[PDB]
Amino acid sequence: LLNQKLGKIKTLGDDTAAWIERSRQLQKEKDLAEKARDLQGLTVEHAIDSFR
Amino acid sequence: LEEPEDARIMLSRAVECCPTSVELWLALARLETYENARKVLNKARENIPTDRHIWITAAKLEEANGNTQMVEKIIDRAITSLRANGVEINREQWIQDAEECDRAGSVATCQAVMRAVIGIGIEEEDRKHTWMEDADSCVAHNALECARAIYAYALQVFPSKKSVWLRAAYFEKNHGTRESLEALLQRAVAHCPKAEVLWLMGAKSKWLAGDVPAARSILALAFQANPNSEEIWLA
Helix, strand or coil, X not given: CHHHHCCCCCCCCCCCHHXXXXXXXXXXXHHHHHCCHXXXXXXXXXXXXXXX | CCCHHHHHHHHHHHHCCCCCCHHHHHHHHCCCCHHHHHHHHHHHHHCCCCCCCHHHHHHHHHHHCCCHHHHHHHHHHHHHHHHHCCXXXXXXXXXXXXXXXXXXXXXXXXXXXXXHHHHXXXXXXXXXXXXXXXXXXXXXXXXXXXXXXXXXXXXXXXXXXXXXXXHHHHHHHHCCCCHHHHHHHHHHHCCCCCCCCCHHHHHHHHHCCCCHHHHHHHHHHHHHCCCCCCHHHHC
């Protein structure tokens, strides 16, 4: 069952230099972005009369 | 990862967001382009400024991609940083820089850095005997540049003991240098002719080299003027 569940998610956890260009664009993008109720039902093991 | 050019590009893109990265700056310094190497050093200066280790990186870069004049200028700039920035020169740093500049780069900048560290930073009281020992230990770990730095620190100042010059001449003999032994003998005889370590040591080195006629010539030179007792006559 877990294998069925863990199949529909891609396991990518393309080039090299244009990836660095992608990183430069991401740097530009991030620079631009920078700019008493709970006690109901509880049982007491004592007689009621025992309380003064 | 498999690509020095892509690695350099990625390191440049990361260092734009990673200022305080000495390792990244040093990696960018090895970009295999001398003009671009100087530009990368200037950018690292424009990055997190050269406080403690980027000075050593710039000194090594001057050792590799440059001559002794710019190396000495960078050494003077670092000495200015040794007081303005508030970071005194460390003996271990100087020894490591000398070893790195002897193994990889030219020994000229290693000798310049050794002189700058033995004059500034390491000087206690009129002797530099600890400096002489440190330079001898560096000579046991580096080339003759450490011995030359010891000679610059000792012989240039007034030699209170000629035994340092005798030890330097013995090291030069261990380096196979006879002309350097003669130069050291001339320097010591004109600075401290008060023992048998200036002319007698040179005459013995000549008489233990293997050239009998040259040994006789050296003995004639050291016994005609005879800057010693009849020991030269016995030799």
